[PDB]
Amino acid sequence: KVEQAVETEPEPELRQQTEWQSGQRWELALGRFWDYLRWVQTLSEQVQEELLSSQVTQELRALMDETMKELKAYKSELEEQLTPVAEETRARLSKELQAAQARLGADMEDVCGRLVQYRGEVQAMLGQSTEELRVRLASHLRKLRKRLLRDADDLQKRLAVYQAGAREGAERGLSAIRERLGPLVEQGRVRAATVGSLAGQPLQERAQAWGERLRARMEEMGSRTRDRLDEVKEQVAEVRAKLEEQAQQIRLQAEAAQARLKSRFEPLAEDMQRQWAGQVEKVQAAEGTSAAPVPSDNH
């Protein structure tokens, strides 16, 4: 909201590389998703009015399945072929996707949860503050929106290379998607989320009122905002997700980094270069300006 996800603003290389590679089909979903993704940001009491109905959730879950439907579709067909090698290196292509894969569902599923929780919590009270919940809503959404972002690219980047064409690896490719998810549904029955988002909680005719809400919404939010992660766990519900997630994130970015290194080393050797200072931020000394990325905060 200020640097966690704002660092990408000045770094259009992510939107340029994806728009050039993908084209528009996949870039569309992930493109429109980022719009409402950050739009969810709030501050003024207006947030309590929007919480009435799962608006950002319906729009988020709507696009989430879109980018995931187009990516998974083109992916399965992409796995059929790998880089121009087919010998041993291809073995890393199986694990590589495993990382970017778990990263997709992780953030995605985390999205619907952030809303379903934030809404299910406030809707249970209907008479609390907003900042107390915003403090965590800023960082949580910051890392949730940042990950899904830096991931969408780092993931689509590998799909651009696979377009090359392999021989033996062609068999291992199909295995990659099989090593990620099998019994489950892509990530974790995301469909089940589309149902909850519909739940909402209408009153009489103000369950949304986004019309006037959006007015002060962006006004106060952009005005200056009074939170900037002041470390104040109010809901302590959604924070758990980003907390336990941010921890495992290291396992993903790690396998995805070590693999990508050699993965792109075959086709080229400049990716790590532009990515060294053009990926998104590279986590400039820890995360969060104030409210550091809590590991778990116990239970």
Short mmCIF file of C-alpha atoms in Angstrom, two decimals:
data_model
loop_
_atom_site.label_atom_id
_atom_site.label_comp_id
_atom_site.label_asym_id
_atom_site.label_seq_id
_atom_site.Cartn_x
_atom_site.Cartn_y
_atom_site.Cartn_z
CA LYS A 1 0.00 0.00 0.00
CA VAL A 2 3.06 2.22 0.44
CA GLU A 3 6.09 0.13 -0.51
CA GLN A 4 5.24 -3.54 0.04
CA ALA A 5 3.12 -3.52 -3.12
CA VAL A 6 3.85 0.03 -4.27
CA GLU A 7 7.41 -0.92 -5.20
CA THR A 8 5.90 -2.59 -8.26
CA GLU A 9 4.42 0.68 -9.50
CA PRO A 10 7.83 2.11 -10.50
CA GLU A 11 8.72 -1.35 -11.80
CA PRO A 12 6.46 -1.77 -14.86
CA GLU A 13 8.95 -4.33 -16.16
CA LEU A 14 6.66 -6.93 -14.57
CA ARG A 15 3.58 -5.78 -16.48
CA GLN A 16 5.61 -5.24 -19.65
CA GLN A 17 7.30 -8.65 -19.61
CA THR A 18 4.00 -10.43 -18.93
CA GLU A 19 1.99 -8.37 -21.42
CA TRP A 20 4.62 -9.14 -24.06
CA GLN A 21 4.84 -12.85 -23.23
CA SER A 22 1.27 -13.78 -22.33
CA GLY A 23 -0.40 -11.45 -24.82
CA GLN A 24 -3.81 -10.57 -23.41
CA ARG A 25 -5.73 -13.78 -22.75
CA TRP A 26 -4.00 -14.52 -19.44
CA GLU A 27 -2.81 -10.95 -18.93
CA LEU A 28 -6.48 -9.94 -18.89
CA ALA A 29 -7.50 -11.83 -15.74
CA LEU A 30 -4.32 -11.09 -13.79
CA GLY A 31 -4.60 -7.58 -15.18
CA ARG A 32 -8.12 -6.78 -14.01
CA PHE A 33 -7.53 -8.74 -10.80
CA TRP A 34 -4.84 -6.31 -9.63
CA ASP A 35 -7.34 -3.50 -10.16
CA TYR A 36 -9.93 -4.65 -7.63
CA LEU A 37 -7.18 -6.40 -5.66
CA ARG A 38 -5.76 -3.12 -4.36
CA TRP A 39 -9.16 -1.42 -4.59
CA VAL A 40 -10.18 -3.51 -1.57
CA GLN A 41 -8.06 -1.09 0.46
CA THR A 42 -10.08 0.95 2.94
CA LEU A 43 -9.84 3.10 6.07
CA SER A 44 -12.83 5.33 6.83
CA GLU A 45 -15.96 3.90 8.46
CA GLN A 46 -17.17 3.27 4.92
CA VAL A 47 -15.33 -0.05 5.20
CA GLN A 48 -17.89 -1.21 7.76
CA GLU A 49 -20.61 -0.51 5.19
CA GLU A 50 -18.97 -2.58 2.46
CA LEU A 51 -18.31 -5.46 4.86
CA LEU A 52 -22.08 -5.97 4.85
CA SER A 53 -21.82 -7.74 1.50
CA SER A 54 -18.89 -9.69 0.05
CA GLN A 55 -18.23 -7.32 -2.86
CA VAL A 56 -14.44 -7.44 -3.21
CA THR A 57 -14.72 -11.17 -2.54
CA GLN A 58 -17.14 -11.86 -5.39
CA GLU A 59 -15.04 -9.78 -7.78
CA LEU A 60 -11.77 -11.27 -6.52
CA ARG A 61 -12.93 -14.90 -6.59
CA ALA A 62 -14.46 -14.20 -10.00
CA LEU A 63 -11.16 -13.13 -11.58
CA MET A 64 -9.05 -15.48 -9.47
CA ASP A 65 -10.68 -18.48 -11.14
CA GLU A 66 -10.23 -16.75 -14.49
CA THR A 67 -6.45 -16.32 -14.43
CA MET A 68 -6.19 -19.75 -12.81
CA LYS A 69 -8.41 -21.28 -15.49
CA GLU A 70 -6.45 -19.82 -18.41
CA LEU A 71 -3.06 -20.50 -16.83
CA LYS A 72 -3.90 -24.08 -15.85
CA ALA A 73 -5.32 -24.67 -19.34
CA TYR A 74 -2.29 -23.35 -21.22
CA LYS A 75 0.00 -24.94 -18.64
CA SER A 76 -1.22 -28.51 -19.14
CA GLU A 77 -0.61 -28.02 -22.86
CA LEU A 78 2.77 -26.39 -22.21
CA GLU A 79 4.06 -29.22 -20.03
CA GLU A 80 3.84 -31.35 -23.17
CA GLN A 81 7.09 -29.67 -24.19
CA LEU A 82 10.11 -28.27 -22.34
CA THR A 83 13.39 -26.49 -23.02
CA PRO A 84 15.66 -27.62 -25.90
CA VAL A 85 17.63 -30.18 -23.89
CA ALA A 86 15.88 -33.34 -22.71
CA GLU A 87 18.53 -35.15 -20.67
CA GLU A 88 18.70 -34.31 -16.97
CA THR A 89 18.13 -30.57 -16.51
CA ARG A 90 14.47 -31.12 -17.37
CA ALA A 91 14.31 -32.84 -13.98
CA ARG A 92 14.42 -29.37 -12.42
CA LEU A 93 11.46 -28.23 -14.53
CA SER A 94 9.25 -30.61 -12.54
CA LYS A 95 10.17 -29.03 -9.21
CA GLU A 96 10.27 -25.48 -10.59
CA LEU A 97 6.56 -25.48 -11.45
CA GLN A 98 5.89 -27.13 -8.08
CA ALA A 99 7.01 -23.90 -6.42
CA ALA A 100 5.22 -21.31 -8.56
CA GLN A 101 2.21 -23.63 -8.38
CA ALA A 102 1.89 -23.79 -4.59
CA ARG A 103 2.43 -20.02 -4.64
CA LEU A 104 -0.61 -19.44 -6.85
CA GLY A 105 -3.21 -21.32 -4.83
CA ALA A 106 -1.57 -20.15 -1.61
CA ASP A 107 -2.22 -16.47 -2.31
CA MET A 108 -5.46 -17.07 -4.21
CA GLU A 109 -7.08 -19.18 -1.50
CA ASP A 110 -5.70 -16.71 1.03
CA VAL A 111 -7.59 -13.93 -0.75
CA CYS A 112 -11.12 -15.31 -0.40
CA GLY A 113 -10.23 -16.20 3.17
CA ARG A 114 -9.17 -12.66 4.04
CA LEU A 115 -12.61 -11.40 3.03
CA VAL A 116 -14.68 -14.33 4.29
CA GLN A 117 -12.97 -13.86 7.66
CA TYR A 118 -12.84 -10.06 7.85
CA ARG A 119 -16.52 -10.05 6.91
CA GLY A 120 -17.55 -12.99 9.08
CA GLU A 121 -15.81 -11.34 12.02
CA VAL A 122 -17.17 -7.80 11.73
CA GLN A 123 -20.61 -9.06 10.72
CA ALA A 124 -20.61 -10.88 14.06
CA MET A 125 -19.97 -7.66 15.97
CA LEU A 126 -21.46 -4.79 13.96
CA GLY A 127 -20.20 -2.03 16.23
CA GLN A 128 -16.41 -2.00 16.40
CA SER A 129 -13.57 0.19 15.11
CA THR A 130 -11.88 0.16 11.71
CA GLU A 131 -8.25 1.14 12.26
CA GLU A 132 -7.63 -1.77 14.63
CA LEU A 133 -8.61 -4.08 11.76
CA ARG A 134 -7.03 -1.88 9.09
CA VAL A 135 -3.56 -2.06 10.63
CA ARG A 136 -3.49 -5.78 9.89
CA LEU A 137 -5.61 -5.40 6.75
CA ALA A 138 -2.89 -3.20 5.25
CA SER A 139 0.05 -5.54 5.80
CA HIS A 140 -1.93 -8.74 5.24
CA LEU A 141 -3.32 -7.55 1.91
CA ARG A 142 0.07 -6.03 1.12
CA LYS A 143 1.88 -9.37 1.29
CA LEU A 144 -1.10 -11.27 -0.13
CA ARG A 145 -1.34 -8.93 -3.13
CA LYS A 146 2.44 -8.67 -3.48
CA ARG A 147 3.02 -12.43 -3.52
CA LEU A 148 0.24 -13.26 -5.99
CA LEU A 149 1.70 -10.47 -8.12
CA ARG A 150 5.40 -11.34 -8.09
CA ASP A 151 4.27 -14.95 -8.45
CA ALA A 152 1.97 -14.42 -11.44
CA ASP A 153 4.99 -13.07 -13.33
CA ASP A 154 7.72 -15.42 -12.10
CA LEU A 155 5.27 -18.19 -12.99
CA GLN A 156 4.29 -16.93 -16.44
CA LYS A 157 7.98 -16.38 -17.15
CA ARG A 158 8.73 -20.11 -16.99
CA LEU A 159 5.74 -20.82 -19.22
CA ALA A 160 7.29 -18.59 -21.88
CA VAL A 161 10.45 -20.71 -21.99
CA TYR A 162 8.66 -24.06 -22.00
CA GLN A 163 7.16 -22.94 -25.31
CA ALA A 164 10.55 -23.80 -26.79
CA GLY A 165 10.20 -27.55 -27.27
CA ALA A 166 11.83 -30.64 -25.80
CA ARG A 167 11.88 -34.39 -26.46
CA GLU A 168 12.33 -36.69 -23.47
CA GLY A 169 11.36 -34.04 -20.94
CA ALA A 170 7.99 -33.94 -22.68
CA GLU A 171 7.09 -36.96 -20.54
CA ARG A 172 8.36 -35.41 -17.31
CA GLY A 173 6.43 -32.22 -17.98
CA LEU A 174 3.03 -33.84 -17.53
CA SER A 175 4.42 -35.26 -14.28
CA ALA A 176 5.13 -31.76 -12.96
CA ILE A 177 1.45 -30.84 -12.75
CA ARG A 178 0.85 -34.30 -11.28
CA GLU A 179 3.43 -33.71 -8.54
CA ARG A 180 1.76 -30.45 -7.51
CA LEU A 181 -1.91 -31.40 -7.17
CA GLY A 182 -3.73 -34.67 -7.74
CA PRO A 183 -6.73 -35.57 -5.54
CA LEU A 184 -7.55 -31.99 -4.57
CA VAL A 185 -8.93 -29.42 -7.01
CA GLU A 186 -6.04 -27.40 -8.44
CA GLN A 187 -5.33 -25.61 -5.17
CA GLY A 188 -7.99 -26.57 -2.64
CA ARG A 189 -11.55 -26.68 -3.95
CA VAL A 190 -11.54 -22.94 -4.61
CA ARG A 191 -15.10 -23.42 -5.86
CA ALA A 192 -16.23 -23.89 -2.26
CA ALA A 193 -15.18 -20.26 -1.79
CA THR A 194 -17.43 -18.95 -4.57
CA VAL A 195 -20.32 -20.13 -2.40
CA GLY A 196 -19.30 -18.34 0.79
CA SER A 197 -18.64 -15.08 -1.03
CA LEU A 198 -22.31 -15.20 -2.03
CA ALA A 199 -23.37 -15.48 1.61
CA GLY A 200 -22.83 -11.83 2.47
CA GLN A 201 -25.31 -10.19 4.83
CA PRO A 202 -27.92 -7.83 3.31
CA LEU A 203 -29.90 -5.56 5.62
CA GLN A 204 -32.43 -3.41 3.76
CA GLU A 205 -30.67 -1.54 0.95
CA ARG A 206 -27.21 -0.52 2.17
CA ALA A 207 -25.34 -3.83 2.22
CA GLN A 208 -23.00 -2.25 -0.32
CA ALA A 209 -23.70 1.40 -1.13
CA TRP A 210 -20.34 1.38 -2.91
CA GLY A 211 -21.63 4.43 -4.75
CA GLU A 212 -21.13 6.91 -1.92
CA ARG A 213 -18.73 4.59 -0.08
CA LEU A 214 -16.11 4.61 -2.84
CA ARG A 215 -16.28 8.40 -2.57
CA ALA A 216 -14.73 8.68 0.89
CA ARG A 217 -13.14 5.25 0.53
CA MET A 218 -10.40 6.34 -1.88
CA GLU A 219 -10.56 9.86 -0.46
CA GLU A 220 -9.45 8.89 3.04
CA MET A 221 -7.37 5.92 1.89
CA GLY A 222 -5.42 8.09 -0.54
CA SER A 223 -5.59 11.13 1.72
CA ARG A 224 -2.85 9.69 3.94
CA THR A 225 -4.33 6.77 5.87
CA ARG A 226 -3.86 6.27 9.61
CA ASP A 227 -2.30 2.83 10.10
CA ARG A 228 0.80 2.10 8.02
CA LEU A 229 0.99 -1.17 9.96
CA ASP A 230 0.90 0.07 13.55
CA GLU A 231 1.07 -3.52 14.78
CA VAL A 232 -2.39 -3.99 16.29
CA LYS A 233 -3.91 -7.44 15.80
CA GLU A 234 -7.64 -6.77 16.12
CA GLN A 235 -9.25 -9.65 14.23
CA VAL A 236 -6.34 -12.06 14.69
CA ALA A 237 -8.19 -14.30 12.24
CA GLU A 238 -6.86 -13.58 8.75
CA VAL A 239 -3.44 -12.56 10.06
CA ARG A 240 -2.91 -16.23 10.90
CA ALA A 241 -3.11 -17.13 7.21
CA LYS A 242 -0.50 -14.63 6.03
CA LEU A 243 1.55 -15.51 9.11
CA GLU A 244 1.68 -19.27 8.58
CA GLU A 245 1.86 -18.65 4.84
CA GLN A 246 4.68 -16.09 4.83
CA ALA A 247 6.69 -18.72 6.71
CA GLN A 248 6.29 -21.42 4.07
CA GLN A 249 6.78 -18.78 1.38
CA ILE A 250 10.53 -19.14 1.91
CA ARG A 251 10.22 -22.78 0.87
CA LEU A 252 8.51 -21.77 -2.38
CA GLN A 253 10.60 -18.77 -3.44
CA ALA A 254 13.60 -20.94 -2.59
CA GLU A 255 12.83 -23.95 -4.79
CA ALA A 256 11.52 -21.59 -7.46
CA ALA A 257 14.69 -19.49 -7.28
CA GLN A 258 17.26 -22.29 -7.26
CA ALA A 259 15.39 -24.01 -10.09
CA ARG A 260 14.70 -20.92 -12.20
CA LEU A 261 18.42 -20.15 -11.95
CA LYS A 262 19.32 -23.23 -13.98
CA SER A 263 15.99 -23.27 -15.83
CA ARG A 264 16.69 -19.90 -17.45
CA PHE A 265 20.42 -20.65 -17.53
CA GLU A 266 19.80 -23.02 -20.44
CA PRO A 267 17.75 -20.68 -22.67
CA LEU A 268 19.54 -17.55 -21.44
CA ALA A 269 21.32 -16.05 -18.44
CA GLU A 270 20.02 -12.50 -17.99
CA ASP A 271 16.78 -13.26 -16.14
CA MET A 272 18.53 -13.35 -12.77
CA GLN A 273 20.08 -10.02 -13.79
CA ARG A 274 16.96 -7.96 -14.47
CA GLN A 275 15.30 -9.90 -11.64
CA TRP A 276 18.06 -8.96 -9.20
CA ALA A 277 16.71 -5.40 -9.22
CA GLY A 278 13.59 -5.61 -11.37
CA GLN A 279 11.52 -8.46 -9.94
CA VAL A 280 9.39 -6.46 -7.50
CA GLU A 281 11.53 -5.46 -4.52
CA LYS A 282 13.52 -8.52 -3.45
CA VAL A 283 12.35 -7.88 0.12
CA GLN A 284 14.62 -4.93 0.93
CA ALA A 285 15.64 -5.91 4.46
CA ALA A 286 12.81 -7.91 6.02
CA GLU A 287 9.19 -7.03 5.27
CA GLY A 288 6.67 -4.51 6.57
CA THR A 289 7.62 -0.98 7.60
CA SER A 290 6.56 -1.51 11.21
CA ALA A 291 4.47 -4.64 11.72
CA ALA A 292 7.14 -7.16 10.71
CA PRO A 293 6.04 -10.44 9.08
CA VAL A 294 4.99 -12.34 12.20
CA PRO A 295 6.04 -16.02 12.04
CA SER A 296 2.93 -17.32 13.81
CA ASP A 297 2.37 -15.30 16.98
CA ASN A 298 1.60 -18.54 18.82
CA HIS A 299 -1.97 -19.80 19.28
#
